[PDB]
Amino acid sequence: SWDKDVYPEPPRRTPAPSPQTSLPNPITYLTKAFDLLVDRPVTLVREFIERQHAKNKYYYYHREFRRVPDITECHEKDVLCMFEAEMQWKRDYKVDQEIVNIIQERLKACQQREGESHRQNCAKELQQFTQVVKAYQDRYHDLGAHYSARKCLAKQKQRMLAERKATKEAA
């Protein structure tokens, strides 16, 4: 299983079955047939497999990366420090890519689970998606396929010069 806070799923409200006619639906009989023929032998095989899983217990971990000094506090043309800052920036690049993927999965899951009212009932998901796409486009877009820490730093400096001129001209 996973976390329901990073993967939000609202509480399912299913209605009670209210039969109007006397003709039986085939679906409950097929649900019973699927439960007896299929679901219980699958569950029993999973029980045997998990009892074989439980005899030996060992753990894999998440690789923790302590933060090395980034590219702004590296000297120029010093490959030992800017190599470390480069690996740090590339890992942050992959992690932010997967953050954008998580927010897209949230958006697509919302648009499916809210039915036809998905234009109304996905306001927060679309808002968070627009914010994370705006942040990702400010950060990593237009770097080119030879992307590095210097390219992202120079893009940040060009954007901050544009913001400084925009605040200076509007004051």
Add this chain to the structure above:
Amino acid sequence: DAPEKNYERTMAILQIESEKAELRLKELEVRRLMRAKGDGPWFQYPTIDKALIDHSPKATPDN
């Protein structure tokens, strides 16, 4: 191999190659200054040895 192994091995390779690149730039600048100024041990094209000179008293004195 470990990512630790490749990481620290990469840093060793980068140290060795960066030191060689800095010393190649120093090699170029030292060669430029020694051809230009001529006061280094390189490019010492030979002049006349002064151990070849006769310093004995000659026959005519104005020399």
